[PDB]
């Protein structure tokens, strides 16, 4: 298709452009180093603070219409379940609160730094750590928000057939929520050492 035809073409320009600069003796000009040393360390940090709360909140709201849209379905013949199956809406939301906490922890570290001590060792580490801490915590919770919603619609059904099936399934949905807690940990160990900008 068209949108799949571009992906074959972007690969081809990068390969022509990767050789023309090489067979002529200019390969060092494509230097990702200077792209990391000269770019402002504030850009890498203000993305990890917006994607953490950005990609996490997409996770929660994703798992809610997979969950709610089926609870409302079963509750046309068995409307008693709306208050017992509410739990699966809580485990979809809590990952958002995991993200909203990190963004406030990292916002404490955003300070003003001089023009001479900007591109120093302690300020490049900070930006690069606050970035891959926002991707990890925003991608883990993005997926935990989907594996809980899916698992939350099966229990919303089985509860409607016979109530004995509900509690036996939360052992799956509780092992689905661990994953959002493990990125919250690892995201901090990165930024446990990083010191605010000087």
């Amino acid at each position: 298709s068209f949108s799949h035809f571009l992906y074959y073409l972007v690969l081809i320009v990068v390969i022509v452009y990767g050789l023309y600069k090489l067979f002529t003796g200019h390969g060092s000009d494509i230097n990702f180093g200077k792209f990391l040393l000269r770019t402002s360390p504030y850009m890498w940090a203000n993305l990890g603070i917006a994607l953490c709360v950005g990609l996490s909140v997409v996770g929660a709201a994703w798992g809610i219409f997979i969950t709610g849209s089926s609870m409302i379905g079963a509750g046309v013949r068995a409307p008693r379940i709306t208050t017992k199956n509410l739990i699966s809406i809580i485990f979809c939301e809590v990952v958002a609160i995991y993200g909203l906490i990190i963004a406030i922890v990292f916002s404490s570290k955003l300070t003003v730094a001089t023009a001479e001590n900007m591109y120093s060792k302690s300020n490049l580490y900070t930006g690069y750590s606050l970035f891959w801490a926002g991707i990890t915590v925003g991608a883990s919770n993005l997926i935990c928000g989907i594996a809980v919603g899916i698992t939350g619609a099966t229990a919303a059904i089985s509860d409607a057939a016979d109530s004995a099936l509900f509690v036996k399934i939360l052992v799956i949905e509780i092992f689905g929520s661990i994953l959002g807690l493990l990125g919250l940990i690892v995201g901090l160990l990165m930024a446990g050492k990083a010191s605010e900008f000087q």
């Binding site: 997979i66 089926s70 379905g73 079963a74 509750g75």
Partner: protein, 345 residues
């Protein structure tokens, strides 16, 4: 994967259908019907189940076995047009191809009325409601096919299916209709198979590619049997009535058209274990209906698929076929074959 993009539009349909199935009658709920004395104790019994107060507008004398079958299917169609009116997009087409099969029944039921010169009002009550279209009763006009084709049936979505049907005589008769009716399921079950192959996502695809491999084997065999009642039919004619999707295709289809006795048929089915011993024993049609529940019983095991809607109907028509079968046994005081009813749930 499976249930990630499903609930966007097709989620509220999944919960309602799976609510309607828990109202199905289990083996225990059939037994209570079996010992009922009359049709009035029957009404007292079914009110306990999901059928409810479905005869409050009825007297004690008016109870018959036909008034029951009519007021058990009327509850199925308000539960289907509901799911059909709440749908959108690909799920609409899937819930429109199912209607293309119930209208072809109404086609061969109006045309036979013209052979026999009957009143349409007496007929349309016998016509199936899901297979309705606006130009239906105009089929009572004439006898020829080209007459009924151009006048009526070109507008309907049955246009592409009569490509192998314009060899009819100037006089049309009953044995010719059954040859017309059976050439449409040959094409219908293919255009509905290339559709599922393309636009339906997984895992409904693997499920429905099986249920169509069954509905074609039920018809590919029963053509070979009914041809034995007749004197002779050419083998090249039979291959234009057999669908081309099933397990019997291509190998076993060769030897069903070319089987002139009941014994040569079992030699053709002996080379597939799915259809091995049905002819060897018992009522044939009860063996198919047993395997029909077992393929629908495995669809409900899935979740996040729109193959449940097909299974919901076919699992609930056998239900109604068991109410009436038992309804006649109780009313007529023959309590011999009252337990032949089929049930899995």
């Amino acid at each position: 994967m499976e249930g990630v993009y499903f609930n966007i539009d097709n989620g509220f349909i999944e919960g309602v259908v799976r609510g309607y199935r828990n109202g199905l009658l289990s083996n225990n709920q059939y037994i209570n019907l079996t010992q009922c004395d009359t049709l009035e104790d029957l009404k007292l019994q079914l009110s306990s189940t999901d059928y409810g107060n479905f005869l409050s507008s009825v007297s004690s004398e008016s109870l018959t076995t036909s008034l029951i079958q009519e007021y058990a299917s009327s509850k199925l169609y308000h539960e289907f047009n509901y799911i059909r009116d709440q749908s959108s997009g690909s799920t609409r087409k899937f819930m429109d191809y199912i209607t293309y099969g119930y209208m072809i029944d109404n086609v061969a039921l109006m045309i036979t009325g013209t052979i026999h010169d009957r009143d349409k009002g007496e007929i349309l009550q016998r016509c199936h409601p899901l297979g309705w279209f606006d130009t239906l009763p105009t089929l009572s006009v004439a006898t020829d096919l080209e007459s009924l084709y151009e006048t009526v049936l070109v507008d309907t979505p049955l246009a592409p299916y009569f490509k192998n049907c314009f060899d009819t005589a100037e006089e049309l008769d009953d044995m010719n209709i059954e040859i017309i009716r059976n050439k449409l399921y040959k094409a219908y079950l293919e255009d509905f198979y290339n559709f599922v192959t393309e636009e339906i996502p997984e895992p409904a695809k693997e499920c429905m590619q099986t249920l169509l491999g069954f509905e074609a084997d039920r018809r590919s065999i029963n053509i070979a049997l009914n041809s034995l009642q007749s004197s002779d039919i050419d083998p090249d004619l039979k291959s234009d009535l057999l669908p081309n999707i099933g397990k019997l295709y291509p190998l076993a289809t060769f030897h069903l058209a070319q089987a002139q006795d009941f014994e040569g048929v079992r030699a053709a089915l002996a080379n597939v274990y799915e259809y091995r011993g049905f002819l060897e024993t018992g009522n044939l049609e009860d063996h198919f209906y047993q395997l029909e529940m077992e393929l629908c019983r495995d669809a409900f095991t899935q979740q996040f698929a729109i193959s449940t809607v097909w299974a919901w109907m076919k699992s609930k028509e056998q239900e109604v076929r068991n109410i009436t079968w038992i309804a006649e046994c109780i009313a007529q005081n023959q309590r011999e074959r009252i337990n032949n009813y089929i049930s899995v749930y």
